[PDB]
Ligand binder design. Structure first.
Ligand SMILES: CCCCCCCCCCCCCCCCCC(=O)OC[C@H](COP(=O)([O-])OCC(O)COP(=O)([O-])OC[C@@H](COC(=O)CCCCCCCCCCCCCCCCC)OC(=O)CCCCCCCCCCCCCCCCC)OC(=O)CCCCCCCCCCCCCCCCC
Ligand SMILES: CCCCCCCCCCCCCCCCCC(=O)OC[C@H](COP(=O)(O)OCCN)OC(=O)CCCCCCCCCCCCCCCCC
Ligand SMILES: CCCCCCCCCCCCCCCCCC(=O)OC[C@H](COP(=O)(O)OCCN)OC(=O)CCCCCCCCCCCCCCCCC
Ligand SMILES: CCCCCCCCCCCCCCCCCC(=O)OC[C@H](COP(=O)(O)OCCN)OC(=O)CCCCCCCCCCCCCCCCC
Ligand SMILES: CCCCCCCCCCCCCCCCCC(=O)OC[C@H](COP(=O)(O)OCCN)OC(=O)CCCCCCCCCCCCCCCCC
Ligand SMILES: CCCCCCCCCCCCCCCCCC(=O)OC[C@H](COP(=O)(O)OCCN)OC(=O)CCCCCCCCCCCCCCCCC
Ligand SMILES: CCCCCCCCCCCCO[C@@H]1O[C@H](CO)[C@@H](O[C@H]2O[C@H](CO)[C@@H](O)[C@H](O)[C@H]2O)[C@H](O)[C@H]1O
Ligand SMILES: CCCCCCCCCCCCO[C@@H]1O[C@H](CO)[C@@H](O[C@H]2O[C@H](CO)[C@@H](O)[C@H](O)[C@H]2O)[C@H](O)[C@H]1O
Ligand SMILES: CCCCCCCCCCCCO[C@@H]1O[C@H](CO)[C@@H](O[C@H]2O[C@H](CO)[C@@H](O)[C@H](O)[C@H]2O)[C@H](O)[C@H]1O
Ligand SMILES: CCCCCCCCCCCCO[C@@H]1O[C@H](CO)[C@@H](O[C@H]2O[C@H](CO)[C@@H](O)[C@H](O)[C@H]2O)[C@H](O)[C@H]1O
Ligand SMILES: CCCCCCCCCCCCO[C@@H]1O[C@H](CO)[C@@H](O[C@H]2O[C@H](CO)[C@@H](O)[C@H](O)[C@H]2O)[C@H](O)[C@H]1O
Ligand SMILES: CCCCCCCCCCCCO[C@@H]1O[C@H](CO)[C@@H](O[C@H]2O[C@H](CO)[C@@H](O)[C@H](O)[C@H]2O)[C@H](O)[C@H]1O
Ligand SMILES: CCCCCCCCCCCCO[C@@H]1O[C@H](CO)[C@@H](O[C@H]2O[C@H](CO)[C@@H](O)[C@H](O)[C@H]2O)[C@H](O)[C@H]1O
Ligand SMILES: CCCCCCCCCCCCO[C@@H]1O[C@H](CO)[C@@H](O[C@H]2O[C@H](CO)[C@@H](O)[C@H](O)[C@H]2O)[C@H](O)[C@H]1O
Lengths: 345, 48, 52, 142, 63, 98, 120, 19, 51, 459
């Protein structure tokens, strides 16, 4: 696409969440959700082949249906209270329908089946955008109404998302699905702590973003979609194995990496509220994430899979990637646990 | 020469080097000035 | 909001037509302007939990 | 709402007494899980017919009902033969009978073992939860 | 050094660790009260900005 | 079949260097690595480390406590007191439940 | 938690009253660890690009160290203020509701009967 | 002996649609 | 001195570590000469019981 | 401790910035000089423990363990030096880095003053250790051993994290001194029974307790030499050190909650000892020997008597040096015939008369020959276990008989009989291999002359 289209489309993608985040009125929050939905569509389907077209279609009908449900909440609330914002007096069922619709937009299970497939049909950089920047708008709405959310709905969604994300990711050889199920599981953690401490949902989002960004950038370095494709990194970009491994352990919540901090503080704050049972199952199923992250580490940095003859040409050539952002996000996403007290508050 | 295809980084990007060093010197001098202006402000507001 | 930019810049992009008792064209009060104007002034500054 | 009242009839009277009332409740409770399971089952992995669809709903709901009826009986029977109401070991025996029933209906000795242990422990922790007042979905305090 | 230093340092540590323990328990009690009662500086939830109420005379009298 | 190196063979480490110590393939680096282990391992740690531990005094008051027990067993025997009381804390200071 | 407290300016990074708090020491263990996180980044950058890890691009390495210490200094100053505010609000609350945080007289061990548990 | 490193048979178990 | 300088690395660490422990002591003097067990009067030219 | 830690953190820059021909000499020279500095901890002239700051502090329990860790780093470097000679330079420096990182964390793990700080360090050791077993292991099974090691630990460790958080949400702190001086008796309710298992299963898995021990024979049988040395000598003792530290806040539930675990240890140790009689793999025979010794350590800690703690601390240090010496000796054969089968090579005393002496002395330490500290542990654990109940002597009597059989059967099989004369590649023992054994055995003999240093907290 020509530079005018990129400027218009990339500005609109950026504009959406900023409108949702800066808006007092609910209809303007909805408007920002529409900008993101509309402008991402051309980006997703740019390569125009049978798979990205299905991906851009499944995404549209999912996110448009969820939009209509959110709008119904915004309108039933204006009927009940004559105002364009949710109040303590807003009907209970109005809030729950907003929650289910937004979770449908985030990809939280059981409204999750679309996310792994859409992430699979699109290029890596748009998976990065979809799994990161596109989550801030629905989440910023939820953080604005956390005093009102029914915790029983939120915890069932979070428990479901942590389980389904673990089980789903355990069966995947496609990296883009492993990233989608990774996302689903982490959204479970952000959502579980939402009605209690919304600040910890922002900590878990930010740490997830700076872990998920370099991971995509790492796969975008050689355009590697499979476990066998990523297994050739020792013979292609061996300098990358040291930080891919840590980021994967960091995404797994293993100490003493930055990714342990979000799970650990969420568990700590959940049990300040006596949320013992939910917290225990959440931490016990987060163990399953580490297993299929460990399996990836086995295939890439801790063993050498067979390589092919044509990869010798690849070595004669010179790469201009990755950029200075990959190194900055790799270190901060793994070696920042000793700064934990400065991140929570 | 040695390389058949001349390297992109054949010689330093003097613009970047001076700019790279320039920002670093500026940030240390600004940082250090800020610190003193805070220790004076801190002391002055608290009777020390 | 989540980024109180409008409040920071001191502008009003959508803050001025949030509720019924807001300004209307040609000074036409909305239905129940008196009651709402009372409720918003009652619950001003005491916070949501006290106001409930 | 009534349907909530019915499921709270299960804890009005000390365990081991009003045995059939409890067995009825956990039998309905198991059926509700079986119906919810079938709904997802038929919708996500649809069958080749429509009778074959309904058969799977019946097979899941009776199996789920059977587990609930064997749990709510074995728990109440054990809780009175031993004359030990406030005791998690009762719910471990009932939960395992539930697990045994699951394996019996599934033609799988392995499921019976896993079901006897996993469900027995889950049932015991439910009892220990009610004694100590653990809440599944607490409300925000801090 | 003599036993004094290790002893009186251990006294200094125990005091620090003890004061911290009481502050942590006091913050939970505080956060429990502010949240449930809304009478403190924390957990203040927004109510509509009253500055945008129209106070002008209206087209009708009853307002 | 696939392209793959054959398995490397069974080398004799003493074939080329009959004074091989076990540390390095290069003789000069090899002897100085043996020397370092013996010096820092045996001459420094084991000798001085053992000495420094033999002259740590009054270790855990094993010596002071004996010197003090003799002082008390004397003082109490001449003054007719019991060698050791049954109660540790004085019964005066203990207000029991009534 | 502290979002809507009184006098809370919107999107103000370091409010004015933070200036009554002592600044972070320049060689703070927390700032120094930022300097090392910057240095490693410069090393990781050279590694990823296939350059001499320590010899290459010292202008970059200097600017990575400076950037992280500079940002860490101001970020540290903000967290000190946020932590100072937390105590400020916590203690002033204790004062305004004394009946809710009663001082307690704790009996001495002479008066307490801790049950004894023999280890046989 | 020599360190075992994955062969063709080992890697073909990640080559499917599912794990 | 371009292949032997590495021998100040660990000796420097020890010296830096010993100094870092001397600070931990300076921070924990809140009970210096105040214990019920070792508190005494200060000798003529004695400024602190321990450092 | 910052004078033991900071110089140790400097072995990492020193590893990378040293010359290719100086890495192994330089690092192994400074590792010894770091284990000398750790002796300063032993300067304990009083009954007050050393508290260095709010973070670190050393006790009579954490000092022997701290020193054993620091002394083991130079030993493992020399052990890893001949089987890494074919790797390029960055792999050696990357191996040396993973071993140093494991020494730094282990020292911080034993010196930590707070349980949460202990837990994080106690979990961080999985990373360098998983990398070692998997990257540098030899057989295809090293991949399944890394999973077994990683997820036995993690599954046990999640409940411990939960329980530690509950302790702080209730007591306000996790400082070990404060929890000691303010401990309140627990009620015997069904919730505290689970709090007890939550606080214990993490450490009981790492020992390992019988039943949940299958990770250890898998990990050992496939780790490189320095992987087994650290595992058998320090990482198992993380479990023991944790249980001693946290069992203060668990009373009186240990008077009854411990029965299932005293019984798995006492019966389990007989099951593991008898396995060593029929174990066809030499590296496997030692690993089950470790499981059966840690059984006594588990049993003695569960009864919390001054003698039982004293015996377990001695057995922790004694087993640390002895099991490591055995793994090094089994490696010495393995680095010649590349086979772990115990019966494959026989009559090795004929061609390795000196190495056959170390075998005998290691074997005699393993079967606890008086006056070695291996017996003092076994003997004081028996004394306490007898007072606990008199019929434990029946099971400890048996285990002592079996322990003699598989110790001598190990020596008789490999060192005696006729030589397996087809093994023309039996090179003379390296000076490096012999120094490695002298460094294990001399401290063990010296500690027997001065047992006071490893009596623990109670004595
Ligand atoms: C270290 C510095 C000392 C120098 C060591 C030395 O040069 O030895 C050379 C000497 C002669 O040189 P060699 O011809 O090469 O001998 C090696 C042969 O291959 C074969 O060597 P070997 O078998 O002839 O000698 C080794 C000897 C083991 O080493 C000994 O020589 C026995 C010394 C006692 C230990 O083997 C045994 O007999 C086992 C003895 C078991 C002792 C049973 C009684 C224990 C309870 C009593 C002790 C407690 C008393 C407390 C009082 C109450 O060999 C040795 O002494 C073995 C070297 C390793 C040292 C063994 C441990 C002692 C230290
Ligand atoms: C909140 C932000 C969430 C992250 C959203 C991702 C935004 C970037 C969108 C994207 O396309 O990422 C790929 C981007 C392209 O750059 P590159 O890989 O170098 O290739 C083309 C340059 N010639 O490569 C990048 O530079 C990605 C950098 C991501 C920055 C994340 C900051 C946090
Ligand atoms: C609250 C959160 C909602 C619950 C999550 C819904 C997940 C639904 C799902 O993934 O089910 C798929 C599964 C496949 O169906 P199928 O393979 O035919 O069953 C076994 C065949 N022998 O279908 C199943 O059979 C799963 C059984 C139902 C589990 C979800 C409902 C449980 C509620 C009780
Ligand atoms: C200040 C601490 C001491 C500084 C001096 C340490 C280095 C001594 C010189 C050296 O590098 O030793 C060289 C030796 C073998 O290397 P090479 O240079 O080839 O010797 C050839 C001799 N024919 O290799 C070695 O022996 C290196 C041994 C270094 C051990 C560290 C010494 C630390 C001393 C405590 C501090
Ligand atoms: C990793 C395991 C270590 C865990 C314990 C964490 C502490 C160890 C790191 C020490 C780094 C450091 O403190 O350097 C900063 C130093 C200022 O230290 P200071 O504030 O004066 O007193 C603190 C005494 N602990 O100022 C300096 O002198 C540092 C400047 C030189 C850095 C090279
Ligand atoms: C001849 C041996 C000898 O010197 O014996 C004297 C001394 C024992 O005398 P002692 O125990 O102090 O007397 C008390 C009342 N009889 O013996 C000793 O004190 C020597 C004690 C040796 C201390 C070990 C030296 C360091 C070796 C590296 C440690 C590696 C082992 C790790 C375990 C450390 C546990 C402390
Ligand atoms: C990427 C963000 C940063 C850029 C910010 C936006 C400003 C961009 C300024 C550069 C503009 C160049 O964009 C310009 O677009 C026009 C259409 O508009 C393209 O032109 C196109 O339309 C013209 C119409 O006559 C035809 O020649 C043809 O169909 C096609 O070339 C030009 O090829 C391109 O040069
Ligand atoms: C205020 C406004 C904010 C503007 C925000 C701008 C965000 C930055 C957007 C970066 C977009 C560029 O990132 C994207 O890079 C990838 C490579 O990874 C290119 O994608 C490429 O994929 C593959 C191989 O990589 C090619 O076969 C394909 O043809 C090409 O599109 C895209 O063409 C480019 O669009
Ligand atoms: C908490 C302790 C710290 C943990 C730190 C984690 C360290 C990283 C562990 C993952 C392993 C790193 O992965 C490791 O990468 C290096 C180079 O990067 C590879 O190194 C080897 O192969 C590559 C090419 O294949 C060469 O450039 C290199 O010289 C060679 O030695 C190793 O074969 C691989 O095992
Ligand atoms: C009081 C305690 C009572 C304990 C018993 C209750 C638990 C019973 C568990 C039954 C578990 C499954 O029960 C068992 O399933 C197998 C499936 O192999 C079926 O067995 C039948 O079919 C299988 C094929 O699957 C044949 O191989 C088998 O020879 C045949 O008998 C039967 O249904 C039953 O033999
Ligand atoms: C201290 C050690 C204690 C050891 C305890 C030993 C007691 C074992 C009792 C198990 C008895 C039940 O026996 C059970 O047999 C079946 C045989 O089908 C095994 O299960 C196997 O068959 C089942 C069919 O039922 C299938 O799901 C599957 O092929 C497999 O799981 C179970 O794994 C085992 O649990
Ligand atoms: C087969 C293995 C399964 C293991 C579990 C065993 C389940 C068997 C027990 C049947 C429980 C019936 O479930 C019943 O649900 C109701 C729902 O309000 C609970 O009700 C409870 O929570 C509600 C919250 O909504 C409170 O308002 C109410 O005061 C309280 O009674 C009952 O306490 C519980 O008894
Ligand atoms: C009381 C608390 C203790 C709980 C401990 C639970 C620990 C859980 C460990 C997870 C083990 C995962 O185990 C995983 O699957 C099996 C286990 O046999 C291993 O697989 C191995 O055996 C299976 C047989 O089933 C073969 O198919 C496979 O070829 C072989 O490698 C995998 O290599 C390992 O990755
Ligand atoms: C397989 C994993 C096993 C998970 C193990 C986790 C450890 C077990 C922890 C003990 C069980 C929960 O312990 C629980 O503690 C909470 C407070 O903390 C208390 O429970 C109670 O707390 C407060 C009062 O204190 C009440 O307002 C609340 O309604 C109730 O939850 C009880 O003490 C016990 O119900």
């Amino acid at each position: 696409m020509n530079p005018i289209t990129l400027a218009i489309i990339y500005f609109t993608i950026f504009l959406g969440p900023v409108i949702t985040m800066s808006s007092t009125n609910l209809m303007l929050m909805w408007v920002g959700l529409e900008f993101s939905l509309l402008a991402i569509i051309p980006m997703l389907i740019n390569k125009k082949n049978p798979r990205s077209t299905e991906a851009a279609t499944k995404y549209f009908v999912t996110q448009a249906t969820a939009s209509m449900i959110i709008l119904l909440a915004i309108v039933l609330n204006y009927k009940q209270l004559g105002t364009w914002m949710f109040q303590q007096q807003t009907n209970g069922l109005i809030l729950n329908m907003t929650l289910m619709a937004l979770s449908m937009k985030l990809g939280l299970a059981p409204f999750h089946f679309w996310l792994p497939e859409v992430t699979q049909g699109i290029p890596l950089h748009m998976g990065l955008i979809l799994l990161t920047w596109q989550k801030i708008a629905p989440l910023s709405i939820l953080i604005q109404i956390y005093p009102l959310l029914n915790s029983t709905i939120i915890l069932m969604l979070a428990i479901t998302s942590i389980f389904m994300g673990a089980w789903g990711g355990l069966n995947q050889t496609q990296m883009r699905k492993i990233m989608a199920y990774s996302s689903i599981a982490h959204m479970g953690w952000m959502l579980a702590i939402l009605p209690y401490n919304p600040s910890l949902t922002l900590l878990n989002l930010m740490i997830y973003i700076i872990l998920t960004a370099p991971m995509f950038m790492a796969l975008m370095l050689n355009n590697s979609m499979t476990i066998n494709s990523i297994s050739l990194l020792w013979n292609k970009t061996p300098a990358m194995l040291t930080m891919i491994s840590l980021m994967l352990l960091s995404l797994g919540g293993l100490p003493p990496l930055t990714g342990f901090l979000p799970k650990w503080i969420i568990i700590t704050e959940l049990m300040k509220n006596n949320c013992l049972i939910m917290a225990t199952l959440m931490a016990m199923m987060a163990l399953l994430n580490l297993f299929f992250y460990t399996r990836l580490i086995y295939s890439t940095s801790l063993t050498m899979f067979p390589t092919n003859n044509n990869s010798k040409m690849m070595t004669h050539q010179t790469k201009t990637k990755p950029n200075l952002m990959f190194s900055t996000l790799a270190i901060m996403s793994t070696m920042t646990l000793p700064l934990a007290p400065q991140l929570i508050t | 020469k040695f390389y058949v295809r001349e390297p992109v980084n054949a010689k330093p990007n003097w613009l970047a080097v001076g700019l790279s060093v320039g920002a670093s010197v500026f940030m240390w001098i600004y940082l250090i000035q800020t610190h003193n202006e805070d220790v004076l402000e801190y002391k002055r507001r608290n009777g020390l | 909001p989540f980024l109180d930019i409008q409040k920071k810049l001191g502008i009003s992009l959508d803050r001025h037509f949030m509720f019924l008792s807001a300004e209307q064209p040609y000074k036409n009060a909305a239905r129940c302007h008196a009651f709402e104007k009372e409720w918003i002034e009652c619950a001003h500054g005491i916070g949501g939990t006290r106001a409930k | 709402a009534m349907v909530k009242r019915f499921f709270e009839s299960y804890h009005e009277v000390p365990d081991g007494t009003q045995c059939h009332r409890k067995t009825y409740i956990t039998t309905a409770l198991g059926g509700i899980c079986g119906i919810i399971g079938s709904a997802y089952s038929v919708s996500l992995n649809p069958a080749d017919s429509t009778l074959e669809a309904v058969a799977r709903v019946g097979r899941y709901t009776f199996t789920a009902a059977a587990i609930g009826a064997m749990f709510g009986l074995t728990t109440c029977v054990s809780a009175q033969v031993r004359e030990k109401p406030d005791d998690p070991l009762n719910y471990f025996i009932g939960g395992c009978a539930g697990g045994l029933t699951l394996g019996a209906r599934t033609h799988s000795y392995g499921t019976a073992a896993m079901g006897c242990v996993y469900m027995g422990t889950a049932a015991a922790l439910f009892k220990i939860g009610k004694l100590e007042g653990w809440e599944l979905f607490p409300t925000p305090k801090v | 050094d003599g036993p004094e230093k290790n002893y009186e340092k251990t006294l200094a540590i125990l005091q620090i660790e003890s004061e911290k323990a009481e502050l942590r328990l006091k913050e939970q009690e505080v956060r429990r009260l502010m949240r449930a009662r809304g009478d403190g500086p924390w957990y203040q939830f927004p109510t509509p900005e009253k500055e945008f109420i129209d106070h002008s005379p209206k087209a009708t009298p009853d307002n | 079949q696939w392209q793959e190196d054959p398995e490397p063979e069974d080398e004799n480490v003493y074939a080329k260097n009959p004074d091989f110590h076990g540390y390095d393939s290069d003789p000069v680096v090899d002897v100085w690595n043996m020397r370092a282990v013996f010096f820092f391992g045996f001459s420094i740690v084991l000798v001085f480390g053992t000495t420094f531990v033999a002259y740590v005094p009054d270790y855990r008051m094993q010596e002071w406590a004996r010197r003090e027990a003799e002082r008390l067993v004397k003082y109490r025997e001449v003054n007719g007191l019991p060698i050791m009381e049954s109660n540790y804390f004085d019964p005066s200071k203990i207000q029991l439940p009534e | 938690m502290m979002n809507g407290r009184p006098g809370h300016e919107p999107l103000k990074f370091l409010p004015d009253e933070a200036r009554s708090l002592p600044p972070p020491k320049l060689n703070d263990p927390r700032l120094v660890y930022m300097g090392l996180l910057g240095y490693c980044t410069g090393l990781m950058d050279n590694m990823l690009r296939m350059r001499p890890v320590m010899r290459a691009g010292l202008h970059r390495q200097l600017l990575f160290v400076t950037s992280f210490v500079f940002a860490g200094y101001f970020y540290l100053k903000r967290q000190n203020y946020l932590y100072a505010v937390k105590d400020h609000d916590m203690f002033g609350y204790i004062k305004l509701h004394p009946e809710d945080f009663p001082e307690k007289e704790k009996k001495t061990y002479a008066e307490i009967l801790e049950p004894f548990h023999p280890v046989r | 002996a020599r360190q075992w490193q994955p062969d063709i048979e080992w890697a073909e178990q990640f080559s499917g649609a599912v794990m | 001195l371009r292949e032997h300088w590495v021998h100040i690395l660990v000796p420097a660490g020890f010296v830096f570590g010993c100094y870092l422990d001397r600070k931990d002591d300076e921070k924990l003097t809140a009970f210096r000469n105040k214990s019920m067990l070792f508190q005494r009067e200060l000798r003529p030219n004695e400024e602190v019981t321990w450092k | 401790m910052l004078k033991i830690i900071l110089p140790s953190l400097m072995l990492l820059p020193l590893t990378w910035l040293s010359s290719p021909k100086k890495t192994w000499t330089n690092v192994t020279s400074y590792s010894f000089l770091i284990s000398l500095t750790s002796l300063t901890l032993l300067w304990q002239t009083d009954e007050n423990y050393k508290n260095f700051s709010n973070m670190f502090s050393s006790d009579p329990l954490s000092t022997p363990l701290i020193i054993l860790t620091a002394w083991l780093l130079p030993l493992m470097l020399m052990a890893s030096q001949n089987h890494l000679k074919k790797d390029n330079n960055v792999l050696q420096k990357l191996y040396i880095s993973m071993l140093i990182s494991l020494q730094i964390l282990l020292i911080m793990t034993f010196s930590a003053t707070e349980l949460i700080m202990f837990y994080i360090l106690f979990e961080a050791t999985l990373i360098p250790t998983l990398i070692i077993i998997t990257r540098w292991g030899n057989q295809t099974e090293r991949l399944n051993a890394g999973i077994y090691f990683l997820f036995y630990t993690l599954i046990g460790s999640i409940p411990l994290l939960i329980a530690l958080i509950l302790i702080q949400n209730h007591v306000g702190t996790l400082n070990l001194m404060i929890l000691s001086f303010t401990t309140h008796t627990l009620d015997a309710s069904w919730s505290n029974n689970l709090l007890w298992l939550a606080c214990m299963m993490a450490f009981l898995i790492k020992m390992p307790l019988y039943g949940v021990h299958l990770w250890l024979p898998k990990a050992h049988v496939e780790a490189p030499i320095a992987g087994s040395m650290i595992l058998a000598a320090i990482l198992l003792k993380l479990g023991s050190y944790g249980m001693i530290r946290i069992s203060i806040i668990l009373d009186p539930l240990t008077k009854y909650m411990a029965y299932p675990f005293i019984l798995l240890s006492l019966w389990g140790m007989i099951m593991t000892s008898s396995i060593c009689l029929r174990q066809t793999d030499l590296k496997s025979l030692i690993a089950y020997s470790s499981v059966s010794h840690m059984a006594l350590v588990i049993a003695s800690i569960m009864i919390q008597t001054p003698w039982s703690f004293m015996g377990a601390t001695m057995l922790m240090i004694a087993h640390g040096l002895t099991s490591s010496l055995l793994f090094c000796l089994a490696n010495s054969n393995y680095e010649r015939i590349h086979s772990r089968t115990m019966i494959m090579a026989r009559g090795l005393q004929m061609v390795f008369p000196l190495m056959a002496t170390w075998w005998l002395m290691a074997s005699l330490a393993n079967l606890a020959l008086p006056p070695s500290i291996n017996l003092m542990g076994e003997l004081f654990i028996t004394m306490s276990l007898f007072s606990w109940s008199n019929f434990t002597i029946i099971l400890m009597g048996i285990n002592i008989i079996i322990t003699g059989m598989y110790s001598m059967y190990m020596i008789i099989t490999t060192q005696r009989g006729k030589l397996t004369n087809h093994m023309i590649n039996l090179q003379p023992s390296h000076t490096r291999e012999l120094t490695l054994m002298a460094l294990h055995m001399i401290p063990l003999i010296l500690l027997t002359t001065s047992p006071k240093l490893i009596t623990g907290l109670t004595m």
